[PDB]
């Protein structure tokens, strides 16, 4: 500001002119040249990474059915835990632009029915997924599945 | 191959700025020289430990010989020290008996 | 002496910068007024390069004064760290002998370990 | 005889590092009678450091030639007369240690008694 | 024996050990970073936090942002030290553009550890902890841009700098280059967010050099010109050009004083009455000019200097106001002019002539 | 880094520890016999830390009263994990006064070679980071002490420099 | 005084920055108008870049004037020696600071007795500085040393050392009686105050902390330096909770190598 108002006034009163560059060059090239001399001489990566960094209790892979190589992918899950029994596969669908959103779980009510243990698992599952917050990931849901199975097994015996 | 050579190379480079024929430059130079020296020393340490583990697992007999040597030597240390305590004990016993 | 020279020189530097900026603006407006179609008088143009030369020379003088003052003060402070004249000369000779001996001992050890 | 050489080389490495640190400390302690004494001490330390470097080189040259079996192979995961002679030295040493225990507990009781009796002679 | 009440101790242990992660989770959510749920990692004993993606706006161009987001693999966070307040974040990179001469030519993953630690006021998972993480990430990205440009331009080299300098250290946050015909000097380039500038630092490492790096005289000019245009090849060329004259300049007695103007425009002053201007040029050229004469006028002189008569003939031996035009030397006679030589006290010829 | 000043009075014991912590025992000797044992349980972890500094490596995590796993009876447990300087391998250690010394070594994938190669992993970028742990039994290993064994392990996971 | 050297260096840096800023201003204005893709950004970018350089020039001139207000008032081969000596002490000074932290030694072994005058002169040499500290020595019983150290009008410390190795410390206030009925030093007693008991515990931890293996003089020097910081007690608050009192106790913990007050509960 101070000591430089005339330059600001000159620049503002000169701007958006077709010959501004020519004027500036012709008025300021020679002294600068003389004083100093010459001038200077499919599947998104996030899903692949999160699958790579999951606990070896899970071996999730692509669904043999449904579409592929798109923004929305489908995965089928299997649980291999020595301390827990076998449960339905609990497949998932991943929408496009997975970060900053949440995946959804495809419920299969008839699969979990006809057994008190399996429907106890299912009601604990519904409770936990209602307890999960927004913007959650798939690893959190898988861990919730494992913990719900463990809690149901503990409650049974 | 011959890690000792660049070991002394780094050691002599640590003294480079002194034997020649305002603080930031010397501080930077000593920082890089010292970190290189320590790294080379730790690598030599690692090589010795790998060789020692291989030799120990291949043939424990030399390890047994070293154990025998140390146990004998410490035996003589104990005997000499207890002998020294006894000599001084006799001395002070007679000193206190002269009363 | 250097300090009062600094106090005297600072306002001259401020005035030089002021007139340099003012004449830069005047020359810019005069040239851009020639470039487009309308007329004005030139008169005392007082070219840009002379002002740049004056500013650079005065800055060089100030830098020289500050460097000389700092060097003199540092030399005095370092010399004070370490009455008859020949005893003073003998002390100086002994000090330089000790420094040379330490340096050559270090160099000899460095040559002995390697090379 | 070779494992002892490896241990000696290791120890000489730590002594080399310690001597370098001591050299830098001694250079720091020099402030412009005794100056010649410090200079002679510096010369002695540098020459013994050079001897230590020579000894380390000799040890490395001796141990380098005498790897057929690599590392990471001998780590165990989940999936003749020497022993006879060693035992006697262990038992004998253990017996000696036990004897020292009796002398030590006796001397400490003596010092406790003299402390307690002398504390209140006033 | 049974007077210890082990369950209450266990509850206090886990509660104190695990409550630090809640604030950090809430803060990584609050600043809009996509993370995963806090989870036990690997073995049961230690908890860990993994972050899926770094924030999109980091300040550089999209193409760099892609190459970055094709070389990251992990951004895990962990806790350590006494009193449970030190964080360590760990990054792993793939397809390293460049190799060092350190033992870092291995299977192309490169690990980088960053460490943060809050004050005893302002809690363990405070806002400040992520701010510094973002600042360090920004610095890494801003250095990575220049590193990528230099790596791209490396195969096309004028073959003069190929034998001059080699890369020494690259840690994704500090670049250390080693140069000199004996590899006796080192330069360091590193961005910081405190001043938003590139700080280049010179140093001497190696058994063949002077008491200094003989480049500290123009450190400010080099820093300014690097900040003007962040290019590595230009700085390497400038160092190659200006290495020779400054080596002879720095050996002058200090009568003589050195004023570093804009780079390659050194000004030598004899006491307080005489001046000389020295320009460095490419392809083994140095220009010597009197400097006491104004380039634009003749009647007026400089404020504090006087002309030196007869200098033009003295300069022409080695090859009124006729000395105002430069004279060309070839980086060899300049050494003889500046190096102290016995008289045909070890006085230099220029000192003798000026005296 | 574990050192105690004990001060014996007329029917109590006072214990001061090298890091600003004071305890008051009693005239019964079970308390004092369990105290020392609980401290001998932490020595091993601090021993592995002080050597992870000396020998090059870098610690990734440290806790000296962990908050997971089974429930201990005399004291409380400790755990650490520490990475190779080249970055690929990693060690992890847990110890407790009742149930102690559970060590595991962790590998880069494409060298465990019994792993079900998942489907979403197609590239060779993701074949360089590290997932499979593998436990190593402490017994039948070289070195008399616990600390000594660690020395031969954290040196064998280093590039074949012979 | 050495502040003038730093002032002169800052003035040199300021004038160099001013010259560089003027050159930058004129070069940037000479460069001209750029493209910047669309028209609207092209208009704003040039003005934004032009304003910053002038603002920097004004700021540099203002700070230079602030410094100007702040500032105030055979031989060659000799100087070549001097400028070398100060180049050595600093060069080792860093090298000794970086090697002691990374100690590579594993054991003292390979593969105590001092004259009383030595201890007396060492303690006197400690006593000559720190004028507030006053130290009195005695040997009522054998060769063990009993030292009474008085600090200001606040602290009285009793230290029992076994052959120059510090062994036991007990501190008390000012008005409390330190001598026994006979007139000798009272070794076995308590301060009858909670804060003084807590700082006795702190002193025990401190003496258990400072342990060099083969330099014993630096240990007592560090202990005395740490004990020196306690004179400022009751006038300095904690660095975490702000207030002086926590459960009725003032800050009684002084951190090692960074001597600042702290409550015991604040660690
Ligand atoms: Zn507090």
Swiss-Prot record, chain A:
It is found in: Cytoplasm; Nucleus. Ubiquitinated by TRIM11, leading to proteasomal degradation. Expressed in all tissues examined, including heart, brain, lung, spleen, thymus, pancreas, blood leukocyte and placenta. However, the level of expression varied, with highest expression in the placenta and peripheral blood and lowest in the pancreas and kidney. Signal peptide: none annotated. Induction: By 12-O-tetradecanoylphorbol-13-acetate (TPA). Belongs to the Mediator complex subunit 15 family. Component of the Mediator complex, which is composed of MED1, MED4, MED6, MED7, MED8, MED9, MED10, MED11, MED12, MED13, MED13L, MED14, MED15, MED16, MED17, MED18, MED19, MED20, MED21, MED22, MED23, MED24, MED25, MED26, MED27, MED29, MED30, MED31, CCNC, CDK8 and CDC2L6/CDK11. The MED12, MED13, CCNC and CDK8 subunits form a distinct module termed the CDK8 module. Mediator containing the CDK8 module is less active than Mediator lacking this module in supporting transcriptional activation. This is Mediator of RNA polymerase II transcription subunit 15. It comes from Homo sapiens (Human). The lineage of its organism: Eukaryota, Metazoa, Chordata, Craniata, Vertebrata. The gene is MED15. The chain holds residues 615 to 788 of 788 of the full protein.
Swiss-Prot record, chain B:
GO terms for molecular function: actin binding. Induction: Up-regulated by endothelial cells when exposed to tumor conditional media. Residues 62-98 form a coiled coil. Keywords: Actin-binding, Activator, Coiled coil, Cytoplasm, Membrane, Nucleus, Transcription, Transcription regulation. Widely expressed. Highly expressed in vascular tissues such as placenta, testis and liver. It is found in: Nucleus; Cytoplasm; Membrane. It is a peripheral membrane protein. GO terms for cellular component: core mediator complex; cortical actin cytoskeleton; mediator complex; membrane; nucleoplasm; nucleus. Its main location: nucleus. Component of the Mediator complex, a coactivator involved in the regulated transcription of nearly all RNA polymerase II-dependent genes. Mediator functions as a bridge to convey information from gene-specific regulatory proteins to the basal RNA polymerase II transcription machinery. Mediator is recruited to promoters by direct interactions with regulatory proteins and serves as a scaffold for the assembly of a functional preinitiation complex with RNA polymerase II and the general transcription factors. Belongs to the Mediator complex subunit 28 family. This is Mediator of RNA polymerase II transcription subunit 28. It comes from Homo sapiens. The lineage of its organism: Eukaryota, Metazoa, Chordata, Craniata, Vertebrata. The gene is MED28. The chain holds residues 42 to 146 of 178 of the full protein.
Curated annotation (Swiss-Prot), chain C:
It comes from Homo sapiens. GO terms for cellular component: core mediator complex; mediator complex; nucleoplasm; nucleus. The chain holds residues 55 to 187 of 200 of the full protein. The keyword Signal does not apply. GO terms for biological process: positive regulation of transcription elongation by RNA polymerase II; positive regulation of transcription initiation by RNA polymerase II; regulation of transcription by RNA polymerase II; RNA polymerase II preinitiation complex assembly. Keywords: Acetylation, Activator, Nucleus, Transcription, Transcription regulation. Component of the Mediator complex, which is composed of MED1, MED4, MED6, MED7, MED8, MED9, MED10, MED11, MED12, MED13, MED13L, MED14, MED15, MED16, MED17, MED18, MED19, MED20, MED21, MED22, MED23, MED24, MED25, MED26, MED27, MED29, MED30, MED31, CCNC, CDK8 and CDC2L6/CDK11. The MED12, MED13, CCNC and CDK8 subunits form a distinct module termed the CDK8 module. Mediator containing the CDK8 module is less active than Mediator lacking this module in supporting transcriptional activation. Transmembrane segments: none annotated. One of its GO terms (molecular function) is transcription coregulator activity. This is Mediator of RNA polymerase II transcription subunit 29. It is found in: Nucleus. The gene is MED29. Belongs to the Mediator complex subunit 29 family. It comes from the Eukaryota. Widely expressed in embryo and adult.
From Swiss-Prot, chain D:
GO terms for molecular function: nuclear thyroid hormone receptor binding; nuclear vitamin D receptor binding; transcription coactivator activity; transcription coregulator activity; ubiquitin protein ligase activity. One of its GO terms (biological process) is positive regulation of DNA-templated transcription. One of its GO terms (cellular component) is nucleoplasm. Expressed in brain, heart, kidney, liver, lung, pancreas, placenta and skeletal muscle. Keywords: Acetylation, Activator, Coiled coil, Nucleus, Transcription, Transcription regulation. Residues 34-58, 80-117 form a coiled coil. It is found in: Nucleus. Component of the Mediator complex, a coactivator involved in the regulated transcription of nearly all RNA polymerase II-dependent genes. Mediator functions as a bridge to convey information from gene-specific regulatory proteins to the basal RNA polymerase II transcription machinery. Mediator is recruited to promoters by direct interactions with regulatory proteins and serves as a scaffold for the assembly of a functional preinitiation complex with RNA polymerase II and the general transcription factors. Belongs to the Mediator complex subunit 30 family. This is Mediator of RNA polymerase II transcription subunit 30. The chain holds residues 29 to 178 of 178 of the full protein.
């Amino acid at each position: 500001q101070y000591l430089c108002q005339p330059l600001l006034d000159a620049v503002l009163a000169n701007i958006r002119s077709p010959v501004f560059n020519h004027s500036l060059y012709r008025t300021f090239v020679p002294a600068m040249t003389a004083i100093h001399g010459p001038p200077i001489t499919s599947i998104p990566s996030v899903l692949q990474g999160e699958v790579a960094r999951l606990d070896p209790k899970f071996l999730v892979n692509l669904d043999p059915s449904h579409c592929s190589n798109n923004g929305t992918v489908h995965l089928i899950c299997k649980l291999d835990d020595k301390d827990l029994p076998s449960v339905p596969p609990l497949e998932l669908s991943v929408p496009a632009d997975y970060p900053a959103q949440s995946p959804l779980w495809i419920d299969r009510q008839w699969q979990y029915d006809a057994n008190p243990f399996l429907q106890s698992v299912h009601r604990c599952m519904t409770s936990r997924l209602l307890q999960l917050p927004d913007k959650h990931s798939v690893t959190a849901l898988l861990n919730t599945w494992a913990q719900s199975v463990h809690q149901a097994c503990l409650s049974a015996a | 191959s011959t890690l000792v050579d660049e070991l002394e190379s780094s050691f002599e480079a640590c003294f480079a700025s002194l034997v020649s024929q305002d603080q930031e430059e010397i501080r930077t130079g000593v920082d890089q020289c010292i970190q290189k020296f320590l790294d080379i020393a730790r690598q030599t340490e690692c090589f010795f430990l790998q060789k020692r583990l291989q030799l120990s697992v291949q043939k424990p007999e030399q390890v047994i010989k070293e154990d025998v040597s140390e146990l004998r030597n410490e035996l003589q240390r104990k005997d000499a020290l207890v002998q020294k305590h006894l000599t001084k004990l006799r001395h002070w016993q007679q000193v206190l008996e002269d009363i | 002496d250097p300090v009062q020279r600094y106090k005297m020189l600072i306002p001259q530097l401020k005035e030089s910068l002021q007139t340099l900026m003012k004449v830069a603006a005047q020359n810019l407006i005069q040239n851009t007024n020639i470039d487009n179609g309308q007329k004005s008088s030139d008169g005392p143009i007082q070219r840009f390069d002379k002002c740049l030369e004056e500013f650079y020379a005065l800055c060089d003088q100030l830098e020289l004064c500050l460097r000389l003052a700092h060097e003199c003060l540092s030399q005095s402070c370092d010399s004070a760290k370490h009455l008859p004249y020949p005893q003073y000369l003998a002390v100086i000779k002994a000090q330089i002998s000790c420094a040379k001996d330490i340096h050559t001992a270090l160099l000899d050890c460095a040559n002995k370990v390697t090379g | 005889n070779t494992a002892s050489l490896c241990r000696i080389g290791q120890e000489t490495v730590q002594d080399i590092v310690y001597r370098t640190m001591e050299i830098f400390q001694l250079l720091r302690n020099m402030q412009l009678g005794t100056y010649q004494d410090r200079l002679t001490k510096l010369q002695d330390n540098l020459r013994q450091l050079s001897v230590l470097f020579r000894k380390l080189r000799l040890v490395y040259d001796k141990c380098n030639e005498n790897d057929p079996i690599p590392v990471e192979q001998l780590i165990p995961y989940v999936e003749s007369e020497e022993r006879r002679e060693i035992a006697e030295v262990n038992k004998k040493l253990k017996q000696k240690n036990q004897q020292l225990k009796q002398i030590m507990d006796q001397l400490r009781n003596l010092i406790w008694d003299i402390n307690a009796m002398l504390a209140m002679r006033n | 024996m049974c007077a210890f009440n082990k369950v209450l101790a266990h509850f206090v242990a886990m509660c104190d050990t695990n409550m630090p992660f809640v604030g950090l989770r809430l803060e990584l959510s609050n600043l809009e970073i996509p993370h995963q749920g806090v989870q036990v990692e690997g073995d049961g004993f230690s908890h860990a936090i993994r972050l899926l993606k770094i924030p999109p706006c980091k300040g550089i161009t999209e193409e760099t942002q892609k190459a970055l987001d094709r070389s990251l693999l992990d951004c895990t966070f962990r806790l350590q030290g006494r009193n449970n307040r030190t964080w360590v974040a760990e990054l792993v990179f793939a397809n390293c553009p460049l190799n060092g001469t350190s033992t870092r030519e291995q299977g192309p993953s490169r690990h980088v550890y960053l460490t943060y630690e809050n004050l005893l006021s302002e809690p363990v998972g405070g806002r400040k902890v992520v701010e510094m993480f973002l600042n360090d990430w920004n610095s890494i990205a801003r250095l990575y841009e220049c590193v990528l440009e230099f790596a791209r331009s490396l195969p096309d080299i004028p073959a003069h700098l190929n034998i001059f300098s080699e890369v020494r250290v690259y840690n994704y946050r500090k670049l250390i280059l080693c140069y000199g015909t004996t590899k006796g000097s080192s330069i360091s380039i590193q961005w910081n967010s405190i001043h938003q500038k590139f700080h280049i630092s010179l140093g001497t490492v190696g058994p063949n050099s002077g008491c200094s790096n003989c480049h500290n005289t123009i450190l400010h000019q080099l820093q300014e010109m690097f900040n003007k245009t962040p290019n590595v090849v230009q700085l390497l060329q400038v160092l190659f050009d200006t290495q020779a004259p400054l080596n002879a300049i720095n050996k002058l007695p200090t009568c003589f004083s050195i004023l570093p103007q804009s780079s390659t425009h050194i000004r030598l002053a004899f006491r307080n009455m005489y001046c000389i201007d020295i320009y460095c040029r490419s392809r083994g050229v140095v220009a010597i000019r009197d400097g006491a004469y104004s380039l634009f006028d003749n009647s007026k002189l400089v404020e504090g200097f006087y002309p030196a008569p007869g200098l033009k003939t003295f300069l022409n031996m080695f090859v009124s106001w006729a000395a105002s035009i430069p004279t060309i030397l070839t980086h060899s006679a300049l050494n003889i002019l500046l190096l102290p030589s016995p008289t045909p006290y070890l006085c230099s010829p220029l000192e003798r002539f000026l005296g | 880094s574990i050192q105690l000043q004990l001060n014996i009075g007329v029917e109590q014991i006072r214990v001061v520890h090298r890091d600003g912590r004071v305890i008051t025992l009693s005239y019964q000797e079970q308390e004092l016999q369990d105290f020392l044992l609980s401290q001998m349980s932490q020595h091993q972890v601090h021993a592995v830390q002080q050597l992870a500094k000396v020998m090059g490596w870098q610690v990734l995590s440290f806790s000296n009263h962990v908050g997971l796993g089974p429930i201990e009876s005399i004291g409380n447990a400790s755990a650490i994990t520490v990475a190779s300087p080249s970055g690929d391998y990693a060690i992890s250690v847990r110890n407790g006064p009742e149930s102690g010394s559970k060590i595991m070594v962790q590998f880069p994938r494409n060298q465990c070679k019994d792993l079900p190669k998942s489907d979403v992993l197609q590239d060779n970028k993701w074949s360089h980071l590290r997932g499979p742990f593998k436990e190593v039994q402490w017994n039948k290993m070289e070195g008399r002490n616990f600390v000594y064994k660690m020395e031969l392990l954290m040196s064998a996971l280093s590039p074949c420099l012979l | 005084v050495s502040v003038n050297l730093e002032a002169f260096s800052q003035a040199i840096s300021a004038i160099q920055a001013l010259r560089s800023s003027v050159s930058r201003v004129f070069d940037c204005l000479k460069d001209g108008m750029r493209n910047k893709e669309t028209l609207e950004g092209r208009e704003k970018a040039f003005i934004a870049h032009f304003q910053d350089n002038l603002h920097s020039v004004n700021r540099d001139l203002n700070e230079l004037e602030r410094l100007s207000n702040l500032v105030g008032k055979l031989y060659s081969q000799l100087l070549q020696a001097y400028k070398w000596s100060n180049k050595l002490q600093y060069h080792a000074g860093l090298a000794s600071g970086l090697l002691n932290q990374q100690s590579l030694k594993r054991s003292a072994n390979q593969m105590l007795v001092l004259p009383p005058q030595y201890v007396d002169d060492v303690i006197s040499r400690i006593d000559r500085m720190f004028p507030e500290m006053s130290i009195h020595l005695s040997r009522p019983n054998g060769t063990s040393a009993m030292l009474l150290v008085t600090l200001g009008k606040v602290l009285k410390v009793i230290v029992v050392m076994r052959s120059l190795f510090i062994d036991r410390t007990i501190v008390k206030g000012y008005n409390e009686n330190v001598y026994t009925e006979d007139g000798k030093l009272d070794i076995w007693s308590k301060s009858n105050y909670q804060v003084f008991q807590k700082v006795t515990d702190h002193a025990t931890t401190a003496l258990l902390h400072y342990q060099l293996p083969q330099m014993p003089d630096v240990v007592v020097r560090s202990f005395m330096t740490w004990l020196r910081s306690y004179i400022k007690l009751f006038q300095a608050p904690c660095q975490r909770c702000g207030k002086f009192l926590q459960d009725g106790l003032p800050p009684t913990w002084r951190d090692f190598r960074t001597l600042e007050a702290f409550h015991d509960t604040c660690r």
